[PDB]
Amino acid sequence: SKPRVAVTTSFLNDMVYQLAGDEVERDLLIPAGEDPHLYVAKSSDLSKLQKADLVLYHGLHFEGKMVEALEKTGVAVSKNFNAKDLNTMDEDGEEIVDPHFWFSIPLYKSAVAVASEELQKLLPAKAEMIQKNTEKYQAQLDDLHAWVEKELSVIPKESRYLVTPHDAFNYFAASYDFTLYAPQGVSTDSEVANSDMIETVNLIIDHNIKAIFTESTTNPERMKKLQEAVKAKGGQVEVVTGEGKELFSDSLAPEGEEGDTFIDMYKHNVKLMVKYLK
Ligand SMILES: [Zn+2]
């Protein structure tokens, strides 16, 4: 009986709950901990999309391998974004868009709005209720932005350099006067160029960076092979991977862990950076 809303990533899974609460029935396609860049829609998945009353996804080719299915049946929460909002890099000609918009709280608040207006119009009777829920979460995102700022303000200008497995924090860095390096491009669907590894090594050396970060969606070996190369130039920069020491880029944490919800996933990321960068 409850409306069925298919949802690509754990990100959206959280958002909708935050907004619609228990009023709708959520169909998460990509399990937390998996990588949407590579996810390939299986029969069951396409089925979920088909059976869905509403389908919500990021867009910007984030899902990477379901554009020709989501664009057909679903609504990208990034439909309202404008050109200047976008981050754009280069890759074999073109002007490739950076999908990791959610670390730009403003952009995420935008997404939240689209999601709200789609759950409203899906539940006419719960529209005001949802709008009320939306406002409360918008404000929580507001408070969050202030939290991150105050939290980051403890990291020295010279230490404002983030190193991650791939380019997924451009929107983040842009929001808080940060510089991001990554041995990989915007998508994770490509071989780790050994020339970008070195590029990164030299960047670490240039800026005397003593901490490179690890993420839950990719193999941390890459960052340990990156650490080894640095030391090969002596060279010595810690790898933040340990246990529970992972940044979330392309996914939240499994319900329910510390990176459970979006705002918590955010705080987790932030605290982690300050600890090894401050
Ligand atoms: Zn990514």
Numbering used by the authors: 32 to 309
Authors' text:
TroA is a substrate binding protein for uptake of multiple metal ions. The overall structure of SsTroA is typical of SBPs in the A-1 family. The peptide chain crosses between the N-terminal and C-terminal domains only once linking the two (β/α)4 domains via a 33-residue kinked rigid α-helical backbone that runs the full length of the molecule and the metal binding site is buried in the interdomain interface. Taken together, the structural and functional data we have presented here clearly demonstrate that SsTroA binds both Zn2+ and Mn2+ with high affinity.
To obtain further insight into the function of SsTroA, we determined the X-ray crystal structure of the Zn2+-bound form of the SsTroA at a resolution of 2.6 Å, and further characterized the recombinant SsTroA. The final structure was refined to a resolution of 2.6 Å and consists of 278 amino acids (residues 40–317). In our structure, we clearly observed the metal binding pocket provided by the buried surface between the N-terminal and C-terminal domains. Independent experimental evidence has demonstrated that the ion bound in the metal binding pocket of recombinant SsTroA is Zn2+ (see metal content analysis). Zinc is pentacoordinated by His 76 (bond length, 2.14 Å), His 139 (2.11 Å), His 205 (2.18 Å) and Asp 289 (2.20 Å, 2.38 Å). His 76 and His 139 are provided by the N-terminal domain, while His 205 and Asp 289 are contributed by the C-terminal domain. The Zn coordination in our structure is best described as distorted square pyramidal. The binding site is buried ∼7 Å below the molecule surface and the four coordinating residues are also completely buried. Accordingly, our structure indicated that Mn2+ is likely to be the natural ligand. Intriguingly, in the structure of SsTroA, we observed two distinctive flexible loops mainly composed of charged residues, and these two flexible loops were designated as Loop 1 (Asn 126-Pro 38) and Loop 2 (Tyr 279-Glu 285).
